[PDB]
RNA sequence: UUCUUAGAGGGACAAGUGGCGUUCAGCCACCCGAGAUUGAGCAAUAACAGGUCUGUGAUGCCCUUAGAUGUCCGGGGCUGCACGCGCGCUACACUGACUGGCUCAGCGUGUCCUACGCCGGCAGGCGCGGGUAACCCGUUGAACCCCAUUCGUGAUGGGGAUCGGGGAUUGCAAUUAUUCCCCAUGAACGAGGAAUUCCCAGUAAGUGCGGGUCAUAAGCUUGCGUUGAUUAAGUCCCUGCCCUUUGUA
């Protein structure tokens, strides 16, 4: 069964927030600037913007 | 033609004093079927001068905590009061109302110049609007207060008050208070 | 009360001394030309400038504005 | 409307002084153990006209009102109206009137004080027994 | 052959449908005289008394009211009726007749044609209402 | 001798809390008779006062 | 002449008088004892309240269709006064509404809906519109 | 002070009502109860009975205020 | 091919209006029967909480709004064409849900 | 597509007219108009030895660390009452209570919101449906108010505190009574001394409804409509504020 539009848009909000908090505490040393999440039913992509990518790879 | 409650005419009514002749609205072009207008007459200054005097009465009727927004009932209180007035005296109630407001208005008031605790007042003149304001306020407080805890209803109490006030009877609360305010102005001068 | 700020004043002035020949006395024409003339941030700001431009264009005929 | 010929000014029923002046339905509320609800149903069940003033009731009518007030169960008054529904001792349904209600109350208070139940102790000390805050309020 | 206009007061809305006929006057399928707040019955009779029944002769209006409260509905319906008539006497009669109606209606009370714009003001934290604040105790 | 007076101009607002207002009044019985008076409540040009004491000053 | 064309106050009294005169309305055993809601302090004064309630119920069901026991409980709701606690909206008695609808079903005036609620029967619509006829005729 | 008003009519008040009420400028439950020292219910009942006979006219009926008057 | 509907839901208005307009003009040029944007009531999520962590201040309150704008576009077109027209239109900050019958 | 939802774009600028203004910035009045001041959010520089380590896996020192200040399980307490203060709710009635009839909302929430049918006076008990929601609850048949009835200045059919019995719902568990219902009991209170708060128009106030707490749940706060005023368009007198002169130990 599927959840409401209201709960769904909230859930995506918490997902974004928690992912950011995790990424900050992990990649702080490699100057993690921000994240961008695009979602497709085939596969959802997460794009990390950081100062020195050579290191975070 | 236009008649108040479709049964009281506004042509046979007559104003006495010229001072209030442009500060009591009830006339040809201010003739309304009901007091209830729901206008913006308290929007800016000197706009309530153009409010029908019957509306000013029924507005100043719904005063104390329990009847603050109970206009629909003050309109029927004024309707019953007007019928009682006509039954008692015989002539147009609007004339009795105008006569009551003409008599009840204090002509010379007292203003506070000095310190708090001590009493020191200068006697001053009263504006025609302020005369109309205090007259209505005093009439309603007299009605209200007189009928608070006794059997006679607000309608016949308001009628009794306006009968007394219109013919300048000492029994009227509004006349007593006017007399006292002018006597205090007379005491100061 | 309502006083025209340095922003609308400065803008209105430079508009006059650039496009004097384009403007006239009518508010709505000045309002419409002010859109084409300047890249302006919002409608209110444009309305206020158009209004004060109208106000200046009145007194320019009366005498030379400083 | 009409002049009363024998207006019984004071009624002496169930060791109580009933004022005939008040209307019968509210007149009998003066009896302890009878409210503005139980009085109504009692009169309706005896099919008396409630409009009548308490002073102008005949001997048989007031005697019927007494006997129907004493034994309600016989006259099809429901179980959920009775003041005493399940009596702690004998476990029967009854309506207790003035002297009976006072006696039953002091007996129930005595019964609670006998066993040393919290409510009994809170009653014996003259405190609240429904678990209100007794700090800020409830003075004297 | 017909026109349809709305009268609005606070959150009350009364839509009057005006067509040709035998001077029929119905609001939510009920006559004006049978409207519940009878104390203000005259407020509904305002537009028909001011103009006169003769103008309503060749006009059937059907009013439907939704939202608001009782007196707000009364002001919505009494506004809607007058706006419907002037709209009909604009579209299917000379402009002179519309002016001859409009001037009388405006001259009596401007509320009959122009809507009272004010609405119930938003409430703020720190008080019970929109302006009033809770009691502030020093010691 | 209770006599009426027209209000021509409002001079200014006076009193400890500006509760009063100072006005120059032209009488009704005499055309050209100006006097300065202090009056309680709201006033404007044209308003007529009923002066009980017509000799005092402000 | 229709129910909407007459006064809705007098109509109920007329219909109640008709429902009394019929003498085939199954009144419960507990009419003399029971209140009419959670929030009423006393029993209703009038002895024939069931007939007035039945009349009211029929009139409500005439005005709109698909009204269940819950809706009828929502109709005859009022203001519960809670002593020192502030007053809240309380609903009517479910049993009285159910027994009234059962009793009116008994007359074949109202029948159950395929959708789920209860609608007035053509026999009902006849009776109600007839009562309106003579209520109008009495002026 | 305490107002001991009469629940039911006595002969001295009842004959006084049937003679004198019938002709007052204003007719109502309040003034009748006040003047004759009657209870509110009996005074309200008396006016209804006088209207049934047809000595007094009903001017306007309402919940709060019922106004009566003499004829001619 | 029967009655596919497309539910576009977003928090931004501009992006939602742009993408929905593109889907419409993309469908219109192919000569397909399209029922236009059905704008439903905007869902406003309100949270009102005290500003302070501790609770000593003048009892100030934040007012957090969250807007949800929902558009319905309806097509009478084959599923093969519906799949590719729904496939081409992707945007970060809009959710699309397609339903048939 | 008028009403309903809501995207784009229009619309108001002291623009037009008349006065007053070193004819400058601008001010007051008036016409035409839906409107000629709508209500908020955001808010600098420089500081409080302001509050919070009991929001945190934000945190330095210190105190304890295995008969612990860790953690968990049973109880009890946080509510304990000769008294003094601070927000409040219900009232003191007749412009009012009670009984019946009539007729209108808006914000917004539901994986727990609830229609419909049956049984019980009522709280509620069963059965079977709709809704992850402009779809079902719901045309959100709300209360004051409106129209009839009874009451009659009586601590009264005002007021419902305190107390006795019963009968239900949560929950593992209800006693120091969780809420809820019924019958009974019927206290102070007749408008409040010195003192003192809040407020300018859809405002004050009356009046209900939804959200947050929420297994059970509003006398609280946070929102929403509904009915809807009196008085003022001013002043620096009180209490403070901003700028400028001075005076200072």
CA E115 to chain centre: 8
Measured between alpha carbons, how far is B135 from B105 in angstroms, rounded to an integer?
Answer: 5
- Picking from E44, E42, I95, E120, the residue whose alpha carbon sits closest to that of residue B75 is E42
Measured between alpha carbons, how far is E61 from E17 in angstroms, rounded to an integer?
Answer: 5
Measured between alpha carbons, how far is D83 from F23 in angstroms, rounded to an integer?
Answer: 77
The experimental technique behind this entry is: cryo-EM
At residue I55, what are phi and psi to the nearest 5 degrees?
Answer: 105, 60
Whether G55 contacts G124, CB under 8 Å? no
CA–CA–CA angle D56, D57, D62 (5° rounding): 155
Full domain range(s) for residue I65: 1-101
- Beta-sheet pairing, I64-76 with I43-47: antiparallel
Measured between alpha carbons, how far is B181 from B107 in angstroms, rounded to an integer?
Answer: 9
CA–CA–CA angle A43, A44, A49 (5° rounding): 140
| H52 is a domain residue | yes
Return the domain boundaries, chain B. 1-189
- Asked if E72 CB < 7 A from strand J, the reply is yes
Subunits adjacent to chain E (3 or more Cβ pairs under 8 Å): B, G, I
Measured between alpha carbons, how far is H15 from D33 in angstroms, rounded to an integer?
Answer: 42
Full domain range(s) for residue H63: 11-70
Whether B73 contacts B67, CB under 8 Å? yes
What are residue E30's DSSP bridge partners?
E27
CA E113 to chain centre: 8
At residue D74, what are phi and psi to the nearest 5 degrees?
Answer: -55, -35
Q: What is the secondary structure of G68-113 as a DSSP string? A: -HHHHHHHT-EEEEETTEEEEEE-B-HHHHHHHHHHHHHTTSEEE-
At residue G49, what are phi and psi to the nearest 5 degrees?
Answer: -65, -35
- Helices marked H in chain I: 14-28, 79-88
Q: What is the secondary structure of I32-96 as a DSSP string? A: -EEEEEEEPPPEEEEE--BS-SSS-SS--B--EEEEEEEEEEEEES-HHHHHHHHHH---TT-EE
Write the Ramachandran bin of G118: left for phi over 0, alpha for psi from -120 to 50, otherwise beta: beta
Is the Cα torsion angle D86, D88, D90, D94 positive or negative in sign? negative
Whether B64 contacts B35, CB under 8 Å? no
CA–CA–CA angle G44, G48, G53 (5° rounding): 75
> Which CATH code is given to the segment(s) D10-75?
1.10.8.50
Q: What is the secondary structure of G36-71 as a DSSP string? A: SBSS-SS--SSTTHHHHHHHHHHHHHHHSS---HHH
At residue E16, what are phi and psi to the nearest 5 degrees?
Answer: -100, 125
CA B132 to chain centre: 7
Provide the domain count of chain I. 1
- Which among D41, D48, D130 is the top mutation candidate for probing chain G, defined by the most G β-carbons within 10 Å of its own β-carbon? D41
Whether B123 contacts B110, CB under 8 Å? yes
- Asked if I59 CB < 7 A from strand J, the reply is yes
Full domain range(s) for residue G104: 1-139
Q: What is the secondary structure of H12-28 as a DSSP string? A: HHHHHHHHHTTS-SSB-
Q: Which residue in the block uniquely carries the two structure tokens 């934290």? A: E125
CA–CA–CA angle B91, B95, B101 (5° rounding): 140
Stated length of chain C:
66
Residues in D 77-106 whose C-beta is less than 7 A from nucleic strand J are 78-88, 95, 101, 104-105
What are residue G112's DSSP bridge partners?
G118
Provide CB contacts within 8 A for C6, sequence distance 6+: none
Question: What number of other Cβ atoms are within 10 A of residue B39's Cβ?
Answer: 17
- Picking from D11, D14, D59, the residue whose alpha carbon sits closest to that of residue D32 is D14
CA–CA–CA angle D37, D41, D42 (5° rounding): 110
Query: After which residues does chain B become discontinuous at a C–N distance over 2.5 Å?
Result: none
CB-contacted nucleotides of strand J (7 Å): 2-8, 10-16, 24-29, 34-35, 37-42, 50-52, 55, 58, 79-91, 93-96, 98-111, 114-124, 132-134, 138-139, 141-154, 156-167, 175-178, 180-186, 190-191, 196-209, 211, 218-237
Which one of F41, F53, F56 has the shortest CB-CB distance to B127?
A: F41
Q: Which residue in the block uniquely carries the two structure tokens 């009903």? A: H58
Measured between alpha carbons, how far is F45 from D71 in angstroms, rounded to an integer?
Answer: 85
Residue E33's SS3 state is helix
Asked if G114 is an interface residue toward chain D (Cβ–Cβ < 8 A), one would say no
What are residue F10's DSSP bridge partners?
F23
- Helices marked H in I7-101: 14-28, 79-88
Provide the CA D49 to C1' J197 distance, Å, integer: 55
Residue D3 DSSP symbol: P
Question: What number of other Cβ atoms are within 10 A of residue A48's Cβ?
Answer: 16
Provide CB contacts within 8 A for H26, sequence distance 6+: B84, B87, B88, B156, H67, H68, H69
Which protein residue has its CA closest to C1' of J114?
A: G70
Full domain range(s) for residue F54: 1-58
| H5 is a domain residue | no
Provide the domain count of chain F. 1
Question: What number of other Cβ atoms are within 10 A of residue C23's Cβ?
Answer: 21
Return the domain boundaries, chain A. 5-57
Stated length of chain G:
139
- Locate C59 and state its tokens: 């007194």
Is the Cα torsion angle B49, B52, B58, B62 positive or negative in sign? negative
Provide the domain count of chain G. 1
Architecture of domain A5-57: 2-Layer Sandwich (3.30)
The experimental resolution of this structure, in angstroms, equals 3.2
Subunits adjacent to chain B (3 or more Cβ pairs under 8 Å): E, F, H
Provide the CA G33 to C1' J117 distance, Å, integer: 26
Which protein residue has its CA closest to C1' of J153?
A: B150
- Helices marked H in chain A: 5-27, 53-56
Provide the domain count of chain H. 1
| H2 is a domain residue | no
Q: Chain G contacts of E30, Cβ < 8 Å?
A: 4
Measured between alpha carbons, how far is I1 from I10 in angstroms, rounded to an integer?
Answer: 26
Whether C15 contacts C39, CB under 8 Å? no
| H49 is a domain residue | yes
Provide CB contacts within 8 A for D120, sequence distance 6+: D109, D112, D113, D114
Distances in Å between the Cα of C35 and the Cα atoms of B94, C8, C14, C54, D133 are 61, 14, 15, 14, 71
Whether I93 contacts I11, CB under 8 Å? yes
Provide CB contacts within 8 A for B8, sequence distance 6+: B82, B86, B92, B93, B94
Distances in Å between the Cα of B152 and the Cα atoms of B155, B160, I37 are 8, 10, 66
- Picking from I95, E114, D3, G132, the residue whose alpha carbon sits closest to that of residue A6 is I95
């Amino acid at each position: 069964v599927q959840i409401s539009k209201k709960r769904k848009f909230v859930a995506d909000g918490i997902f974004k927030a928690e992912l950011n908090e995790f990424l900050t505490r992990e990649l702080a040393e490699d100057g993690y600037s921000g994240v961008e999440v695009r979602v497709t039913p085939t596969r959802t992509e997460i794009i990390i913007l950081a100062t020195r990518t050579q290191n975070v790879l | 033609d236009i008649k108040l409650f479709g049964k009281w005419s506004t042509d046979d009514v007559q104003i006495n004093d010229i001072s209030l002749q442009d500060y009591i609205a009830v006339k040809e072009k201010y003739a309304k079927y009901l007091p209830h207008s729901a206008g913006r007459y308290a929007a800016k200054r000197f706009r309530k001068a153009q409010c029908p005097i019957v509306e000013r009465l029924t507005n100043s009727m719904m005063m104390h905590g329990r009847n603050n927004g109970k206009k629909l009932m003050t309109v029927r209180i004024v309707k019953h009061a007007f019928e009682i007035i006509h039954l008692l005296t015989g002539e147009n109630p609007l004339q009795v109302l105008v006569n009551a407001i003409i008599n009840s208005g204090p002509r010379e008031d007292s203003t506070r110049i000095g310190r708090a605790g001590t009493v020191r007042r200068q006697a001053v003149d009263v504006s025609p609007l302020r005369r109309v304001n205090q007259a209505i306020w005093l009439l309603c407080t007299g009605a209200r207060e007189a009928a608070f805890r006794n059997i006679k209803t607000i309608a016949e109490c308001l009628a009794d008050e306006l009968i007394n006030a219109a013919k300048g009877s000492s029994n009227s609360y509004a006349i007593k208070k006017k007399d006292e305010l002018e006597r205090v102005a007379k005491s100061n001068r | 009360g309502r006083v025209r700020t340095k922003t609308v004043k400065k803008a209105a002035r430079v508009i006059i001394e650039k496009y004097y020949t384009r403007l006239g006395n009518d508010f709505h024409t000045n309002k419409r030309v002010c859109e084409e003339i300047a890249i302006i941030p919002s409608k209110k700001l444009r309305n206020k400038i158009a209004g004060y431009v109208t106000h200046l264009m009145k007194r320019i005929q009366r005498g030379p504005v400083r | 409307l009409v002049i009363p010929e024998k207006f019984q000014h004071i009624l002496r029923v169930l060791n109580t002084n009933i004022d005939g002046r008040r209307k019968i339905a509210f007149a009998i509320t003066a009896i302890k153990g009878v409210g503005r609800r139980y009085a109504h149903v009692v009169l309706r069940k005896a099919d008396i006209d409630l409009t009548k003033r308490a002073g102008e009731l005949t001997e048989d009518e007031v005697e019927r009102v007494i006997t129907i007030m004493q034994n309600p169960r016989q006259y099809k008054i429901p179980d959920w109206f009775l003041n005493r529904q399940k009596d702690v001792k004998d476990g029967k349904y009854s309506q207790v009137l003035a002297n009976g209600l006072d006696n039953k109350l002091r007996e129930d208070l005595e019964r609670l004080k006998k066993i040393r139940a919290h409510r009994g102790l809170r009653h014996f000390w003259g405190l609240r027994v429904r678990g209100q805050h007794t700090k800020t309020t409830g003075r004297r | 052959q017909s026109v349809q206009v709305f009268g609005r007061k606070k959150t009350a809305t009364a839509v009057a449908h005006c067509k040709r006929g035998n001077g029929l006057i119905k609001v939510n399928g009920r006559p004006l005289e049978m409207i519940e707040p009878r104390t203000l019955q005259y407020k509904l009779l305002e537009p028909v008394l001011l103009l006169g029944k003769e103008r309503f002769a060749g006009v059937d209006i059907r009013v439907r009211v939704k939202g608001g409260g009782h007196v707000a509905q009364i002001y919505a319906i009494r506004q809607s009726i007058s706006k419907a008539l002037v709209a009909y006497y604009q579209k299917y009669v000379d402009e002179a007749s519309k002016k001859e109606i409009k001037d009388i209606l405006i001259q009596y009370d401007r509320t009959l044609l122009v809507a009272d714009p004010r609405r119930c003001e938003s409430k703020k934290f720190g008080g019970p209402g929109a302006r009033a604040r809770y009691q502030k105790s020093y010691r | 001798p209770i006599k009426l007076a027209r209000v021509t101009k409002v001079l200014g607002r006076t009193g400890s809390q500006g509760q009063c207002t100072q006005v120059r009044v032209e009488f009704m019985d005499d055309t050209s008779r100006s006097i300065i008076r202090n009056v309680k409540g709201p006033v404007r040009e044209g308003d007529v006062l009923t002066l009980l004491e017509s000799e005092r000053e402000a | 002449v229709t129910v909407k064309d007459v006064n809705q106050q007098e109509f109920v009294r007329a219909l109640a008088a008709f429902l009394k005169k019929s003498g085939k309305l199954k009144v419960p055993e507990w009419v003399d004892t029971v209140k009419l809601a959670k929030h009423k302090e006393l029993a209703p004064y009038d002895e024939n309240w069931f007939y007035t309630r039945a009349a009211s119920t029929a009139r409500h069901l005439y005005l709109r269709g698909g009204a269940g026991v819950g809706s009828m409980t929502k109709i005859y709701g009022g203001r519960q006064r809670n002593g020192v606690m502030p007053s809240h909206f309380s609903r009517g008695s479910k049993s009285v509404a159910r027994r009234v609808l059962q009793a009116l079903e008994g007359l074949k005036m109202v029948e159950k809906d395929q959708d789920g609620g209860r609608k007035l029967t053509p026999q009902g619509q006849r009776d109600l519109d007839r009562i309106a006829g003579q209520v109008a005729a009495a002026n | 002070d305490k107002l001991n008003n009469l629940v039911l009519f006595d002969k001295a008040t009842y004959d006084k009502l049937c003679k004198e009420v019938p002709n007052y400028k204003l007719i109502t439950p309040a003034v009748v109860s006040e003047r004759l020292k009657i209870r509110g219910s009996l005074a309200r009942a008396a006016l209804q009975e006088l209207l049934s006979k047809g000595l007094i006219k009903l001017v306007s009926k309402h919940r709060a205020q019922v106004i009566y008057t003499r004829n001619t | 091919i029967h009655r596919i509907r497309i539910t576009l839901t977003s928090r931004n208005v501009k992006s939602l209006e742009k993408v929905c307009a593109d889907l419409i003009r993309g469908a219109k040029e192919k000569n397909l029967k399209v029922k236009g944007p059905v704008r439903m009531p905007t869902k406003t999520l309100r949270i009102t909480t005290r500003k302070t962590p501790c609770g000593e201040g003048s009892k100030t309150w934040d007012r957090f709004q969250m807007r949800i704008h929902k558009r319905l576009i309806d097509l009478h077109s084959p599923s093969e064409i519906v799949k590719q027209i729904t496939s081409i239109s992707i945007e970060p900050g809009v959710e699309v849900e397609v339903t048939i019958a």
